[PDB]
Design an enzyme around this catalytic site. Structure first.
Site, PDB file in Angstrom:
ATOM      1  N   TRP A 130       0.941  -1.135   0.000  1.00 13.50           N
ATOM      2  CA  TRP A 130       0.000   0.000   0.000  1.00 13.50           C
ATOM      3  C   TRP A 130       0.973   1.174   0.000  1.00 13.50           C
ATOM      4  CZ3 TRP A 130      -1.070   2.521   4.958  1.00 13.50           C
ATOM      5  CH2 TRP A 130      -1.953   3.582   4.837  1.00 13.50           C
ATOM      6  N   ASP A 211      -0.789  -5.335   9.160  1.00 16.55           N
ATOM      7  CA  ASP A 211      -1.543  -4.240   8.569  1.00 16.55           C
ATOM      8  C   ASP A 211      -2.784  -5.045   8.135  1.00 16.55           C
ATOM      9  OD1 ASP A 211      -1.803  -1.400   6.361  1.00 16.55           O
ATOM     10  OD2 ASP A 211      -3.071  -2.476   7.858  1.00 16.55           O
ATOM     11  N   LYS A 246     -12.998  -0.421   5.915  1.00 17.43           N
ATOM     12  CA  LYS A 246     -13.445  -1.155   4.729  1.00 17.43           C
ATOM     13  C   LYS A 246     -14.570  -2.139   5.076  1.00 17.43           C
ATOM     14  CE  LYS A 246      -9.781   0.956   2.547  1.00 17.43           C
ATOM     15  NZ  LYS A 246      -8.650   0.390   3.340  1.00 17.43           N
TER      16      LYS A 246
HETATM   17  C1  LIG Z   1      -7.133   0.302   2.984  1.00 17.33           C
HETATM   18  C2  LIG Z   1      -5.891   0.150   3.702  1.00 17.33           C
HETATM   19  C3  LIG Z   1      -5.561   0.875   4.802  1.00 17.33           C
HETATM   20  C4  LIG Z   1      -6.485   1.863   5.368  1.00 17.33           C
HETATM   21  O1  LIG Z   1      -6.130   2.705   6.443  1.00 17.33           O
HETATM   22  P1  LIG Z   1      -7.338   3.527   7.007  1.00 17.33           P
HETATM   23  O2  LIG Z   1      -7.030   4.877   7.520  1.00 17.33           O
HETATM   24  O3  LIG Z   1      -8.005   2.446   7.774  1.00 17.33           O
HETATM   25  O4  LIG Z   1      -8.165   3.879   5.700  1.00 17.33           O
HETATM   26  C5  LIG Z   1      -4.362   0.635   5.443  1.00 17.33           C
HETATM   27  N1  LIG Z   1      -3.537  -0.292   4.931  1.00 17.33           N
HETATM   28  C6  LIG Z   1      -3.799  -1.032   3.885  1.00 17.33           C
HETATM   29  C7  LIG Z   1      -2.874  -2.071   3.401  1.00 17.33           C
HETATM   30  C8  LIG Z   1      -5.012  -0.819   3.234  1.00 17.33           C
HETATM   31  O5  LIG Z   1      -5.304  -1.530   2.176  1.00 17.33           O
END
Ligand SMILES: *Cc1c(COP(=O)(O)O)cnc(C)c1O
Ligand SMILES: *Cc1c(COP(=O)(O)O)cnc(C)c1O
Lengths: 396, 396
Positions: A130, A211, A246
């Site tokens: 990410w 994560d 999510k």
């Molecule tokens: C979607 C996602 C996040 C999201 O962080 P938030 O602030 O909860 O939106 C973090 N890490 C990964 C790998 C993700 O795919």
């Protein structure tokens, strides 16, 4: 002071949504959205969440500050979702959880805290990982290195290259994993794989940091945690960062949490204090609203039941496009195999496509895809699938 | 990794609320709460906020991510509350605002951003200043120094000592001010004072950063900003950190914002990008809920009107205890003057009392007061005033 030179060269957000926000023909969305979309292209607000939003309109008595760690109920609740039912890690009181403006909040907070208390110097992220990973940790002054993963070509996890890239790491080094399947390519270590990462991980040093956004999106609320869980079968020390952003479709509320583990409860406590330390030093306490929704759905088992079915829906639509993508692509004329996109998990997958197909698709084509060829299965609706698949195969 | 030595020696929170949470007789509260309390000792949830909370239950269509900077409406809205009506700083587009998990969020975010883009090395806070100030900025790696302020003895602002302590500062140094009256002693520079800090502030360097929670609590929404505003009459570069946590009684929602100013709009933009930079690197975007309440009350002028009256109530109860404190104290027998506590502003004031009166009050006395002799006028109710004042004068 600000006067002369600064400026961003920024995030793959307006890096696609703004040209979309203008490049208007009948634009086949971006498949470069970061959120889920339903069979109509809307990222709804959930029945479990609304019903819960109402339970709060009426039951709230004060907007009084939350504890630093937040809602303890959320605590119990989050912990049990990640580690399990009779989890001897809960009764045993080795885990402690902090409520945070979630997901990124948690990786940050995790970051700032490792950065003192600990002598972690590097973080190993994964190529790719990410996009916002690197920034969180560089921000806290930890250097980030990348391990292999999806060397691609043969669309799966170059397991061997990973293990191989990893050995460069070392004892007080944090190794970042995505519990259940990876942004941007839902490619999974199977339990065995997950299992050997763990065997390796203890015999070499590595504080593992999960994560974990996406639980319940690959196979199921409880199976998705298996990875977290086997590591957890044997760590003593482990840290996981979560998001109900999510799974609860709570994106803007900012819900998630940071769980820390220690060998025993005394140790867990000297360290959690110092994670709360890092919290009073960031934002003094987390935002209630989102988590109460969260704490409220996970406790009310009628509301849980209704909640488990929406997620099921989510995850299912996501599965239905992945087949449909590969199907609409057959029929329409493609010179390739993409049977690999029904094998992956989550919203994301890289459409094996070139920086220039990706770009030949936004000219007299109209589809938005971040330059990496990564698409979000979630933006594909049963009807936009026609045109999309015309366009994808008209470039190969 | 966490195993052996860490632990907190912590915040004046459980540093008083937990002994309160146990030291049960008929405990005269802590006057060491950080929140307002009504004539019954409750920290209500507001009619303006509820009505607004409902407008959202029904009107929300998605929980889709907020922009990094947040709700632009909140933007407009916050900006106009701080700088004014026909404010030529708004039309002129020198100000840009970020929505943040507010108050501390903003000082942090402000911190992390100064820490690069800028070459600010030190921050000058004020003795005393809100306790959590030092931690925010040390966390970001800025050294904090203290300027004089309330040398005390004669309960007012040692204006001279301030000016005098300040000259040690220098050009690229940030000077932290509390717009309208200071935690922990609501002692105010009068407009003139505010005015000379500003004259001085431009001729010497100092990027001024306002810490602004409390607007509308001293004299009025618009007068409270005068300090912010005169500085702002002459800065080009200025930064203010806000919170609707106290004024909207939104404590747990985490509402507030970070406004940055530049000479002109081009410059404002190269820098705001880099403040958004620091935001994707903290929590990726702010939590909607609180601010929508906020954005919704400030736009709906019926809801604003209803909102302005609650705050008025707040601020007024606060004024009524401050007289009552001094009165119940007369009548009951005190060897001193404390006519100084009706002169100060806000929830807070130091009861000129010793570390040991403070402590002789929690034995067979029962009142909780953080060791500094600082009381929260807000925890004093018309009836608990009797016993409190028996107890205060029974030690002097
Ligand atoms: C979607 C996602 C996040 C999201 O962080 P938030 O602030 O909860 O939106 C973090 N890490 C990964 C790998 C993700 O795919
Ligand atoms: C109350 C207060 C704050 C509050 O920060 P939030 O997170 O908005 O609660 C910040 N600074 C000062 C000086 C305060 O008095």
């Amino acid at each position: 002071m600000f006067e002369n030179i600064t400026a961003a060269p920024a995030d793959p957000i307006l890096g696609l949504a703004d040209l979309f926000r203008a490049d208007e023909r009948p634009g086949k969305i971006n498949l470069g959205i970061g959120v889920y979309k339903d069979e109509t292209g809307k990222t709804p607000v959930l029945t479990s969440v609304k019903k819960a939003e109402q339970y709060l309109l009426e039951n709230e008595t004060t907007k009084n500050y939350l504890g630093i760690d937040g809602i303890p109920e959320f605590g119990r609740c989050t912990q049990e979702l990640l580690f399990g039912k009779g989890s001897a890690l809960i009764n045993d009181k080795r885990a402690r959880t902090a409520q945070t403006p979630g997901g990124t909040g948690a990786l940050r907070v995790a970051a700032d805290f490792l950065a003192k208390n600990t002598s972690v110097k590097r973080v190993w992220v994964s190529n790719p990982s990410w996009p916002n990973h690197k920034s969180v940790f560089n921000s806290a002054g930890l250097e980030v290195r990348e391990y292999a993963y999806y060397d691609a070509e043969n669309h799966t996890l170059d397991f061997d290259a990973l293990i191989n890239s990893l050995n460069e790491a070392q004892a007080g080094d944090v190794v970042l994993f995505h519990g259940c399947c990876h942004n941007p390519t839902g490619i999974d270590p199977t339990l065995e794989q997950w299992q050997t990462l763990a065997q390796l991980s203890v015999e070499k040093g590595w504080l593992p940091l999960f994560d974990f956004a996406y639980q319940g999106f690959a196979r199921g609320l409880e199976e998705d945690a298996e990875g977290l869980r086997a590591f957890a079968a044997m760590h003593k020390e482990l840290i996981v960062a979560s998001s109900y952003s999510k799974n609860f479709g709570l994106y803007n509320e900012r819900v998630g949490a940071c769980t820390l583990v220690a060998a025993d409860s005394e140790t867990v406590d000297r360290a959690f204090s110092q994670m709360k330390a890092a919290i009073r030093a960031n934002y003094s306490n987390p935002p209630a609203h989102g988590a109460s929704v969260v704490a409220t759905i996970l406790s009310n088992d009628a509301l849980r039941a209704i909640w488990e079915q929406e997620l099921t829906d989510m995850r299912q639509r996501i599965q239905r496009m992945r087949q449909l993508f590969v199907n609409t692509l057959q029929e329409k004329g493609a010179n390739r195999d993409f049977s690999f996109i029904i094998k992956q998990n989550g919203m994301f997958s890289f459409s094996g496509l070139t920086k220039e197909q990706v770009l030949r698709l936004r000219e007299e084509f109209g589809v938005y895809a971040v330059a990496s060829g990564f698409v979000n299965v979630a933006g594909m609706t049963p009807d936009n699938m026609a045109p999309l698949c015309e366009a994808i195969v008209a470039v190969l």
